[PDB]
Write a protein that binds this DNA or RNA. Structure first.
Lengths: 90, 82, 55, 106, 95, 91, 80
DNA sequence: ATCAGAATCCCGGTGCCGAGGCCGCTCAATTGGTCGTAGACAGCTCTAGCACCGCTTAAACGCACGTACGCGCTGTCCCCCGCGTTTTAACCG
DNA sequence: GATATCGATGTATATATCTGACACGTGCCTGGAGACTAGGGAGTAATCCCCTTGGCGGTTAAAACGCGGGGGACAGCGCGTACGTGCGTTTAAGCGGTGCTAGAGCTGTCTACGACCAATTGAGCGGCCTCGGCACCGGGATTCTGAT
């Protein structure tokens, strides 16, 4: 029953659920792992976290759309592979 | 520790955004592949974005370079700079 | 790479099908050159086992 | 004073901003010149269209503030705009406030 | 060059001419500035592509009109070309 | 459905056209006139357009078929194409 | 009429017999046909404009190549 | 698991029309000088880049009970596959 | 047990208040307008030619109807199961800021360089001579599969 309340609440709010400091730290670590001693902007980190958030919410909307198409709600890894293969990035 | 943070990125947030996306239940084999391909995608994005910035003899990755790198990738998103 | 694939394919000369197989063989080439295909496209045997009628 | 083309052309959008590119970028030896006014007019009219669409979208929720959520909602209500940027998704898009029958109870 | 050029201020001027009370947010302001700069670069690239392909070592009006036609849908660009042709003829005739 | 996969393999090896001169020709000719009359189309170009169309059809139909495998066993539906198109962004 | 019948039913059945689809339907043929009209009309319209800029009124190979490169998903035609 | 059947995979003979290749030429590729001009390196202004801290706690992670659904079996009917035959039209010339 | 007080403690009910964020002006800054000189490029059209549509015949594999037919999306039920939801633990995310300092971006200087011009010359493609694997028709080896 609380799913309706959660849907209304998440429609009323839009806070970024991925945090800036862990993703910033991950980007710093990975960048310094590939090429050492390079700086990264905070605005670029925010843009990258926004891009990743948009990518995953679009992918999960596609996953939900495929789920309800096959009269289901829970999904299997095959749907994710499906979406990536139709998008062709894999 | 400032290394080996592959386990650092958290699945609960993806689950909560899926819940916001309508999904009412997920599985365990999903995140096994999802996290791996997400890490591969992040590696590729960081690689080409930092490759983009290297032209102008700069050391810091700028906003417009990242936006134009995503634009070349065909998965673009707009933000403050660009 | 197309010539090696064609020799594996038992043909002396190059054809577009061998070019397609050469492109699809390397995963990086599928990553980058995936936006372009060549006539009568092909792909590795990624068929499943649910197409055949069950018993 | 100083007779600039903005008042003569009757256009607020910058005229020689493109001329900057053409001059310093050295694109060709025969580039732009007349291109500025043309693209400025096209950009102005497209921005007017986008402003109208965003204003129409904002009033649907009895609110009078502009947020990129509403930009995503206005764009996704347009199929042609979708086809323009089909390989693009704007952050904070979420889902629409209209709920399908699949989620609601019996 | 030291002054950080922004393109959202021109949109703000038009907005104030129409509805100065209401306005946009900071992140949204960044979004429209990035959109304006992206469309600006895309039309510049379209002009460059057309100029390269047709051995077009010039770009007066027909080239950028064709670029506008390629970028935008058929009917809207056709109307824009009509008013643009009228405007350029009027501007040349007036002086 | 079982011999169909064998036919899938057979048409997979095939590397020749199908409807160039008499058909597709009349098609592009018709559409051309519809937009602007008195148009023509190079034979090599005709072949290239037919191969591009059939390759894109192969890819999109393969995508729709793998989406139809999610609906259990084997059966295509209009909603399969519609959904896939929307997901990709074509629709 | 013959504009929609330019491509027959077993033609789409062959395209399904080489495109994964093992089970087909009547309405599927019509949908695929309409998608084909959308694609063909887009390419031919692009070619018409490009062959109108140079005042030629006929497409060459290079014209087709540039027209399909404008769609994003580029292709390599014959000749050049 | 095991034998027979349809389709398929590779090969052989022929029509040919677009491929393999010779020659000119002419419009472009190369070499050489000028030098103001525009990219590479030291320096001014100063912004935010790497890493952590006082304090509260939202949330990630680990764990307990159980239900909506994951996956599989069963009934159906309708709705498209398999095949014989005709026409009809695709590629050929 | 009733009538008439005491208070009391959530429950609103506003009422200031001060704070993050949006909306207007402001000092100033740097690049376009005017403008003349000088270089090139497509509008327009003629001309060789070629090449793609229209069309006649053919002729054999493919489109399409008739008939038989079987199998699978949908619906519902049943065994299981895995996260849904919530409780306990911990731990840095966040707000706001700092220590140390690197370079974003620009400015100045300096020094190799490519448009321009001209002579020399040669590579790619048109034209055209010559030819050989694609495509079609037919047979032997390979693969998958129906029925048992």
């Amino acid at each position: 029953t609380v799913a309706l309340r959660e849907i209304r609440r998440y429609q009323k709010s839009t806070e970024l659920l991925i945090r800036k400091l862990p993703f910033q730290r991950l980007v710093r670590e990975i960048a310094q792992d590939f090429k050492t001693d390079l700086r990264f902007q905070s605005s670029a980190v925010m843009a990258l976290q926004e891009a990743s958030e948009a990518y995953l919410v679009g992918l999960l909307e596609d996953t939900n759309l495929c789920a309800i198409h096959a009269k289901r709600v829970t999904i299997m890894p095959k749907d994710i592979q499906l979406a990536r293969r139709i998008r062709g990035e894999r | 520790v400032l290394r080996d943070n592959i386990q650092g990125i958290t699945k609960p947030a993806i689950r909560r955004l899926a819940r916001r996306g309508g999904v009412k239940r997920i599985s365990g084999l999903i995140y096994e592949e999802t996290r791996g391909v997400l890490k591969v995608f992040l590696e590729n994005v960081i690689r080409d974005a930092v490759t983009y910035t290297e032209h102008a003899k700069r050391k810091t990755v700028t906003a417009m370079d990242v936006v134009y790198a995503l634009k070349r990738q065909g998965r673009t998103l707009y933000g403050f700079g660009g | 790479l197309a010539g090696n694939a064609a020799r594996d394919n038992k043909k002396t000369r190059i054809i577009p099908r061998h070019l397609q197989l050469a492109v699809r063989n390397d995963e990086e080439l599928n990553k980058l050159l995936g936006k372009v295909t060549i006539a009568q496209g092909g792909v590795l045997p990624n068929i499943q086992a649910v197409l055949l009628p069950k018993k | 004073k100083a007779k600039s083309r903005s008042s003569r052309a009757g256009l607020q959008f910058p005229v020689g901003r493109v001329h900057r590119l053409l001059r310093k970028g050295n694109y060709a030896e025969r580039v732009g010149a007349g291109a500025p006014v043309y693209l400025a007019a096209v950009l102005e009219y497209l921005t007017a269209e986008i402003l109208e669409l965003a204003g129409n979208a904002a009033r649907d929720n009895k609110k009078t503030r502009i947020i990129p959520r509403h930009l995503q909602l206005a764009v996704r209500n347009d199929e042609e705009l979708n086809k323009l940027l089909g390989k693009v998704t704007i952050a904070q898009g979420g889902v629409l406030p209209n709920i399908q029958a699949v989620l609601l109870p019996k | 060059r030291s002054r950080k050029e922004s393109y959202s201020i021109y949109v703000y001027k038009v907005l104030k001419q129409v509805h100065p009370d209401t306005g946009i947010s900071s992140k949204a302001m960044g979004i429209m500035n990035s959109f304006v700069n992206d469309i600006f670069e895309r039309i510049a690239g379209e002009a460059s592509r057309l100029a390269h392909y047709n051995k077009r070592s010039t770009i007066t009006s027909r080239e950028i009109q064709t670029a506008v036609r390629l970028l935008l849908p058929g009917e809207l660009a056709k109307h824009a070309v009509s008013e643009g042709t009228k405007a350029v003829t009027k501007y040349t005739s007036s002086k």
